[PDB]
Structure 1
Amino acid sequence: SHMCDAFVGTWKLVSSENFDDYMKEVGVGFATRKVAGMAKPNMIISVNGDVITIKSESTFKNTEISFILGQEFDEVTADDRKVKSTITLDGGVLVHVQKWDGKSTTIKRKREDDKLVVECVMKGVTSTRVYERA
């Protein structure tokens, strides 16, 4: 309980850096990169018992994942990858690893001041996405 209290809520995307290059590194094609790169999603995080739910409400895609920390699950990502995901808490940071086709990417979500900072890493390429409360 209370593991993710400071994450819970509705968050709106306010800045994105290097996201096109992250998507390229992941394998996303041109048209999806262009449309996905325009979107300014709301990320909605809730907790009920041990189950954490993260929704992304956007003009590109809507996505939803529900999970228990440390317990692998199937995820279809916004760019349509079918991945196996595991999310843990490490030092107060949500660490989300996605595995598909022999590849791996990691998404970290953390609270910093009044922001929720999302860092996406694929090999040498990082993208930083900053969200604020909606």
Structure 2
Amino acid sequence: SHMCDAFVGTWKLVSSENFDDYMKEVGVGFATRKVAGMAKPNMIISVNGDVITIKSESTFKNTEISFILGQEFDEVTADDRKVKSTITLDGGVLVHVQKWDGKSTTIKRKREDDKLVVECVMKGVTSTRVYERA
């Protein structure tokens, strides 16, 4: 067992707050905001040795990232940004920083009760997206 065990599984989006304004701040255009904001993704998290894999599946896009904690990687996001990402575990929270074009956004995934609470922050705008086990 590892602390990260609490994240493993299939998680379904159950609520979202302020995601449209967060996407505006990230620079996402109108049409992608509307279609992406409509999505109800599942977030599938698994661990094999030191490698964590996080899949996002939805009607909009399916994405997958695999990574080792603290080791930067290149990622293409669902909205087609080309970003440099680093994910760490900080006090029980998975902290995902994405850098591109001199910008940065931070995505925090935390277990709270039976939920996975995900806070996304860009330029002082936060969106909170909550997932429950499938």
Report the TM-score range of the alignment, normalised by the length of the smaller protein: over 0.9
Give, in angstroms, the shift of residue 123 of structure 1: 1.2
Displacement, 1:130?
0.2
- Matched residue, 1:79: 79
Deviation (angstroms), 1:129: 0.1
CA positional deviation for 1:2: 1.2
Deviations 1:48-87 (A, max 9, x none): 0000000001000000000000000000001000000000
Structure 1: distance between partners of 2:118 and 2:82: 21
How far apart, in 2, do the equivalents of 1:55 and 1:132 lie?
Answer: 15
1:5 offset after TM fit, Å?
Answer: 0.2
Q: In structure 1, what is the Cα distance between the partners aligned to 2:132 and 2:67? A: 23
Mapped to 2, the partners of 1:32 and 1:123 lie a distance apart of 20
Name the SS of the counterpart of 2:25 in structure 1: helix
User: Residue 121 of structure 1 aligns to a residue in which SS?
Assistant: strand
Residue in 2 that maps onto 1:30? 30
Give the distance between the partners of 1:88 and 1:40, measured in 2 at CA: 26
Identical pairs, percent = 100
In structure 1, what is the Cα distance between the partners aligned to 2:3 and 2:101?
32
- 1:3, distance to aligned residue in structure 2 (A): 3.4
The number of residues matched between the two structures is 134
Could you say what the CA RMSD is over the residues aligned between the two structures, in angstroms? 0.6
Give the TM-score of the pair, scaled to structure 2: 0.99
- Could you tell me how far 1:102 is from its partner in structure 2? 0.4
Aligned to 1:6, what secondary structure does the other structure show?
helix
Tell me the alpha carbon deviations over residues 18-44 of structure 1, each in whole angstroms, 9 at most, x when there is no partner.
000000000000000000000000000
Report the alpha carbon displacement of residue 13 of structure 1 after superposing the two structures with TM: 0.1
Q: 1 CA distance for matches of 2:101 and 2:117?
A: 27
Runs (4+) of structure 1 moved beyond 3 Å? none
| Separation of aligned partners in 2, 1:9 and 1:24 | 30
Q: Secondary structure at the match of 1:4?
A: helix
Could you tell me how far apart the structure 2 residues matched to 1:41 and 1:103 are? 25
User: Which consecutive unaligned segments of at least 5 residues does structure 1 have?
Assistant: none
Structure 2 residue runs of 5 or longer lacking an equivalent are: none
The CA distance in 2 between the partners of 1:16 and 1:60, in whole Å, is 16
CA distance in 1 between partners of 2:95 and 2:83 (Å):
15
